[PDB]
Amino acid sequence: EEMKQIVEEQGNKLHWAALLILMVIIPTIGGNTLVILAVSLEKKLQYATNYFLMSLAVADLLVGLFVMPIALLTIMFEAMWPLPLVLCPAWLFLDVLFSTASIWHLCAISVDRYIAIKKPIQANQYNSRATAFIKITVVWLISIGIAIPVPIKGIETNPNNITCVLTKERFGDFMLFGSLAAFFTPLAIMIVTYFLTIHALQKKAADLEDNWETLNDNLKVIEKADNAAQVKDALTKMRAAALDAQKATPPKLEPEMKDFRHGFDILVGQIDDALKLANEGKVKEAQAAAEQLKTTRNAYIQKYLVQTISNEQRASKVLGIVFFLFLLMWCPFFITNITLVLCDSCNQTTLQMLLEIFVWIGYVSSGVNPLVYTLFNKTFRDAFGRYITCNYR
Ligand SMILES: CC(C)CCC[C@@H](C)[C@H]1CC[C@H]2[C@@H]3CC=C4C[C@@H](O)CC[C@]4(C)[C@H]3CC[C@]12C
Ligand SMILES: CCN(CC)C(=O)[C@@H]1C=C2c3cccc4[nH]cc(c34)C[C@H]2N(C)C1
DSSP states (O other): OOOTTOOOOOOOOHHHHHHHIIIIIHHHHHHHHHHHHHHHHOGGGOSHHHHHHHHHHHHHHHIIIIIHHHHTHHHHSOSSOOSOSTHHHHHHHHHHHHHHHHHHHHHHHHHHHHHHHHOOOOSSSSSSHHHHHHHHHHHHHHHHHHHTHHHHHOOOOOOSOOOOOOOHHHHHHHHHHHHIIIIIHHHHHHHHHHHHHHHHHHHHHHHHHHHHHHHHHHHHHHHTOOSSHHHHHHHHHHHHHHHHHHTTSOOTTOOOSOOTTHHHHHHHHHHHHHHHHHHHTOHHHHHHHHHHHHHHIIIIIHHHHHHHHHHHHHHHHHHHHHHHHHHHHHHHHHHHHHHHHHOSSSOHHHHHHHHHHHHHHHHHHHHTHHHHHHTTSHHHHHHHHHHTTTOOO
16 A cells, blocks of 8 residues: 555664662673682582572573673564575574573572572581582573574574574464463473472471470479489480571581570580480489580580571571562563463564563563672672772682
8 A cells, every 4th residue: 555654764773771780780791700700719619509590690690791782683673584585583592591590599598498498407418519510410401402493493583584483483482382381381490499488487486496495494394303314314415406496507617706506515515424424323413514514505506596597597687678579570571471472362563572572571580690799798798898999809
């Protein structure tokens, strides 16, 4: 048809590209460099947890370095693909790869924190350097597999002109099941681990309270004991609970000030000595020793119990909120991407416009994610402050 009023010539969108550089691309590249430099040279930050965390910082750095800048060309020159043709499947592949790896890294981290709560007795038996490298490798294999349909299939190609996009027609299956594997599955897992963590912390605080009153009750049992035999087992009941309460937390392998967990080492040592008296038969002498156990209880143990529960609870809450924001900002993209495949009434043209926008809410979500996470750690936070002032020694 002929419509001369159809002056639908796309205006210049350079100001949006400049704003994504300033507000998204630079914070992504800068923020993940800091996290990488920190784990790299700051010798006090080099352990298993961070090597996995560094891997995440790498994935997010690669997003802002190879995915995000070429995504600007989607914006500057709206119609066509400026780069060579083989760069199109390469770019799309790197996009799905690095974006998926970031989401799955957080899923794994969540599981580790829950495991660290449930079973703190995992000192280099696992959660070591070998364990670190295995889960790093797996996450990448998962994200490689999810991303690999894109280059294997490719974008259809006559003129050597291509439009770099995943259409509903050609990648409908991938747009649907590729989102489930990359987002909604690690989302479901993180929802499950969330409630499991609440149960773990409540069950842990409960057990500690039981250990506490076990110590105190048996103290009165000892103090009010006329017989010898009931002193001996009242002491061994204390010894079991003390070890029980101590084992609800890793050793101080970890740390510059007081270590309340050491109180259990002292307490048990006193119990054993008092238990030697009970065996010899010196009951009156043993009861006096048991009264001295209270000094250890008042000094170390009482503060330890509130220390453990409060600290584990706190670290749990903040980790949940930051991981919640990550997922929440990735929500508008993947929900839209799904409805693009499952809704046939919606205008695909404008439903694609929302995709091209929501992807930047996700990009900045992945990009600044390790920074926001590491900033609640003092060693990282102090390291950053020295880096931004260009100080290395
Ligand atoms: C065209 C666009 C993408 C420019 C990219 C921005 C890059 C080149 C610039 C902008 C801000 C810069 C960062 C600013 C802060 C620091 C602290 C310094 O101790 C280490 C390098 C680091 C992390 C810089 C690395 C390079 C950096 C990320
Ligand atoms: C606006 C257009 N772009 C960029 C070219 C996308 O829609 C990208 C397509 C993706 C995508 C499609 C289909 C399945 C998937 N799993 C994981 C991703 C994914 C990542 C996801 N990236 C982040 C955006």
